[PDB]
């Protein structure tokens, strides 16, 4: 239960809705409510590249490092891809007839998932001219979050304001199963535990709770209570035995992933927390979070 948290870099900006770490460069991507996106080198504290993408909120953003791209989704309904070395706009298309909430990138195949207020998840194939390969229908409210299972990325999970998580197989039209979460104000976020020892998933809700699920038994393993307003996200750390959550209550919380009790609450001072990223290979155990008033990168 020993934590050593250091602030690596924090900067003020307009509301950060999406955030992501580059796997091999010391960079973080932020996507802003103002329509701007920024790539920061958090070691030198200098901007790599920034773009005014649109005038609408950009809620979702990811690196596709193996292609030197970022991919972003915005309230103008569009997915756009930029080469971060040249700034080339690679593609720009309407993906859904409504807001894009979340984007996920497959770890090996040229697949992107987008989740939308249009009640659907859509699968795009960038090696087939960004074709719409499949639409997953079944949710009954905004799809807030999509995530591939890192241990079996032929499957993915979607978290929805309809109070469910659905787990799907690529190429199949109905969910493999639906978790009725009992989080009655909806699911804002879903994440997979990344290691082989536990088949766990985690959900965050406006109902102030975080729940841990065993995806083989479909049972709720634990409920984490303590946040004082909407919980924006909750994730498992890739190297440390912790869960990190963030909330409109303005805090990040670090929870023990064995006992499911809170270990530390951080009052970041940037008002509401919206998004989170962890460094994929645990470099310096970095995490980053985006808030109303900027972002912070912390080493643990």
């Amino acid at each position: 239960m020993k934590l050593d948290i250091k602030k690596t870099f924090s900067n003020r900006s307009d509301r950060v809705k999406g955030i992501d770490f580059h796997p091999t460069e010391p960079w973080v991507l932020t996507t802003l409510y103002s329509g701007r996106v920024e790539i920061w080198n958090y070691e030198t504290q200098v901007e790599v590249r920034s773009i005014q993408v649109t005038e609408t909120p950009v809620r979702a953003g990811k690196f596709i490092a193996r292609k030197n791209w970022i991919i972003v989704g915005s309230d103008d309904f569009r997915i756009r891809v930029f080469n971060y070395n040249t700034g080339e706009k690679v593609v720009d298309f309407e993906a859904h007839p409504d807001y894009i909430r979340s984007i996920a990138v497959h770890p090996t195949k040229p697949y992107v998932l987008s989740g939308s207020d249009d009640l659907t998840v859509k699968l795009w194939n960038w090696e087939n001219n960004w074709a719409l390969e499949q639409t997953f229908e079944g949710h009954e409210h905004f799809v807030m979050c999509v995530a591939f299972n890192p241990k079996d990325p032929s499957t993915f999970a979607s978290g929805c304001l309809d109070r469910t998580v659905k787990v799907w197989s690529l190429g199949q039209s109905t969910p493999n199963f639906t978790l009725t979460t009992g989080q009655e104000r909806g699911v804002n976020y879903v994440d997979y535990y990344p290691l082989p020892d536990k088949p766990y998933m985690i959900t965050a809700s406006d109902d102030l709770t975080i729940k841990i699920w065993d995806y083989q038994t479909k049972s709720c393993v634990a409920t984490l209570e303590g946040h004082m307003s909407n919980v924006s996200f909750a994730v498992f750390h890739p190297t440390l035995p912790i869960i990190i959550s963030g909330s409109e209550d303005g805090t990040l919380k670090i929870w023990n992933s064995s006992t499911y009790k809170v270990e530390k609450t951080l009052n970041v001072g940037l008002e509401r927390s919206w998004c989170i990223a962890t460094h994929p290979t645990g470099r310096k155990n970095y995490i980053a979070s985006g808030f109303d008033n900027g972002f912070t990168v912390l080493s643990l």
């Binding site: 509301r15 409510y33 909430r101 905004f142 807030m144 304001l161 509401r272």
Partner: peptide
């Protein structure tokens, strides 16, 4: 109008 922020 849900989740506009």
């Amino acid at each position: 109008a849900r989740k506009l922020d």
